[PDB]
Amino acid sequence: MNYQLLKTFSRQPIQFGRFLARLLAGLVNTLKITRTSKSIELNLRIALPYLTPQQRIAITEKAVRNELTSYFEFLSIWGSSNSKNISRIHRIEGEHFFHEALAAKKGVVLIVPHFGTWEVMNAWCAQFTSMTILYKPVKNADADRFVREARSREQANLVPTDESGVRQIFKALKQGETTVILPDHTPNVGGDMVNYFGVPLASSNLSAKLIQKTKAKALFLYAIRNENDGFTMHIEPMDEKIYEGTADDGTYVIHQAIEQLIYQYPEHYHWSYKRFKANPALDNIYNIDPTEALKIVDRLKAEALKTSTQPEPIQTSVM
Amino acid sequence: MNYQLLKTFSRQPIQFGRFLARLLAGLVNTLKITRTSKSIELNLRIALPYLTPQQRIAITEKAVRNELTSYFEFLSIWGSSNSKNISRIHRIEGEHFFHEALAAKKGVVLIVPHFGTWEVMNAWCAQFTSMTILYKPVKNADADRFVREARSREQANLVPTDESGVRQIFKALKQGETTVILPDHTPNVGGDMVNYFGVPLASSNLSAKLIQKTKAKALFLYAIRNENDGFTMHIEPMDEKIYEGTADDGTYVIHQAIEQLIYQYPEHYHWSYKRFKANPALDNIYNIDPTEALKIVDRLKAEALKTSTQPEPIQTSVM
Ligand SMILES: CCCCCCCCCCCCO[C@@H]1O[C@H](CO)[C@@H](O[C@H]2O[C@H](CO)[C@@H](O)[C@H](O)[C@H]2O)[C@H](O)[C@H]1O
Ligand SMILES: CCCCCCCCCCCCO[C@@H]1O[C@H](CO)[C@@H](O[C@H]2O[C@H](CO)[C@@H](O)[C@H](O)[C@H]2O)[C@H](O)[C@H]1O
Ligand code: NA
Ligand code: NA
Ligand code: NA
Ligand code: NA
Ligand code: NA
Ligand code: NA
């Protein structure tokens, strides 16, 4: 369909192609593009060490393509009506757990890793529940309008990423409603050193804090595109251990679920994010040479296992 | 206008964003993008040695952006009606020479370097003359349809890039009509070693052959975008020396005109093309390390000047 493609490329005002070319040109001229590719490949090195160098490149290439594809699909999703987006949901596994958790009326925490095409699940979810979501305003103003408009359409209640937003989320849960937390980025402020692929990383405790206090039901969700179709969406109950222990133990149970998802579907995780920076030993690992980076990481995964048998709280010390 | 941009990005079918992402992904995954950037910078090294390293990067970056911009503008031009494209011509310098050459009824050869946004001149030119143009079918089939459709709309007579097309062009000129030759690429088959920025390069003789035999008028044409507007188009008569000597002497006069254009507007030449490969000493200069490449080129620009004082035809020998 290269032609109906060009047929609309060529139908738009000429300043549109100009604006798009300057955007691409900025990327080709900043080396932001090849910096991304090496971060993906370093991340795969760290999280999936058993890949051959041949398998890494194959997954790196599918991941580059798949993450890029998801952002375009996000645009399509955000510019589409709710019914169109709901119709994009081809199949759902585990729908039962979602309606059941709604039935319990103790709240629902949807745990969504940066994986596949998660934005497509919102319109479908929103027809069964009120949704309250953390929202960081987007730097550029028109992107923020375009996203806020799409959230307005999907009925989402946006709250600030601060304590007042957390309070509104707690309130939403206590009223039997739903929240979506993306738990797998490094928090801007704080928090807890929790192992991620064997590496202690500064991690959010928000999901566990919400769940363990309110006894809300925790569901693990992700959606993967089907070749020239819509998306299969997967709803899985979080292991009941998430309710036990400290918030950090709950966060660790969330980390295990993400790891298992990544193990099965490494090409569908969004590897561009520089997650493994979030350790005081690892602040520079994306700047330095990858093979030294990996020596530092391997150094650290070993210390952390040896220090966990030791009575001393070494890895969770934040300094 | 980032929003009305996204407003149509998001209005298209989701498989459209998918197709576009796979295209980008292919480029980021092939290193075709950073290969292009080093070819541009090597070309500027060769043709514009007086640039500081600081000035090169600035022009490299504007050239990357400007060549990319021209291809998007070509799409817009090819998908636009003739009147829309004519309206995109903001100003014309030297229109007089064009109507006068048409008046002489000995034919008109429009010499168009790969520079700026040349496709925008066609619709304007075609309202005064019949145009016959060499056409190589585009590899991909829908691109070929999209381009052939645009040429059909612009009234262009397409002829094959072989002797039969050259014959049709000669016939068109003898009937007082017009042809457009892009003279500044390396021919697929043959031809003559003519200095380009001091470097003997295998070059087309077609423009000079046409002009010197038929006594058609030769015009030098180029168009440059105006910041968020259309394009200024420039029509300049070729130096009368183009009629003198051999076809290769005529080609050299064409090369001087392109060099002067590049000197004034280096950011508007399409530097991605690997022009300086076209010498038996230079076949690998884009693969090797640029600083050795440039030693080989500097070696060659010196030999060529020393051999031109020598009675021996060294540089024009093809082996
Ligand atoms: C017009 C250009 C074409 C767009 C195609 C590629 C654009 C994507 C590149 C940006 C890369 C990551 O960019 C990141 O995107 C996410 C969504 O995933 C934005 O996220 C924003 O919307 C999402 C979804 O409601 C929320 O989770 C978040 O709170 C909010 O800030 C981030 O603000 C931005 O940092
Ligand atoms: C949908 C993708 C978006 C397109 C944006 C970028 C695409 C451009 C990248 C291609 C780079 C150079 O690509 C080159 O383009 C020229 C036009 O300049 C094509 O040229 C084709 O049309 C032109 C114009 O009628 C003729 O001069 C030529 O005889 C014909 O083959 C070449 O066949 C192709 O080799
Ligand atoms: Na692992
Ligand atoms: Na969404
Ligand atoms: Na703890
Ligand atoms: Na020069
Ligand atoms: Na044209
Ligand atoms: Na000669």
Structure write-up:
- The structure is a homodimer of 319-residue chains.
- In chain A, α3 (32-47) packs across α4 (53-78), α3 packs parallel to α12 and α10 crosses α11 (247-264).
- Chain A has one domain (1-319).
- The first copy, chain A, has helices at 2-9, 14-30, 32-47, 53-78, 82-87, 95-104, 121-126, 141-153, 163-174, 206-214, 247-264, 290-309, and strands at 89-93, 108-111, 131-135, 157-160, 178-181, 192-196, 199-203, 217-225, 231-237.
- Chain A is an alpha/beta fold and 319 residues long.
- In chain A, a hairpin with a 5-residue loop joins β8 (217-225) and β9.
- In chain A, the strands form two sheets. In chain A, strands 1-9-8-2-5-3-4 form a seven-stranded mixed beta sheet. A two-stranded antiparallel sheet of chain A has the order 6-7.
- Chain A starts with a helix and ends in a 10-residue tail after the last helix.
- Helix content of chain A is 50%, strand content 15%.
- Chains A and B meet through α1, α2, α3, α4 and α8 of A and α1, α2, α3, α4 and α8 of B.
- The complex binds dodecyl-beta-D-maltoside (2 copies) and sodium ion (NA) (6 copies).
- One dodecyl-beta-D-maltoside is lined by residues 71-72, 75, 135-136, 138, 147, 182 of chain B.
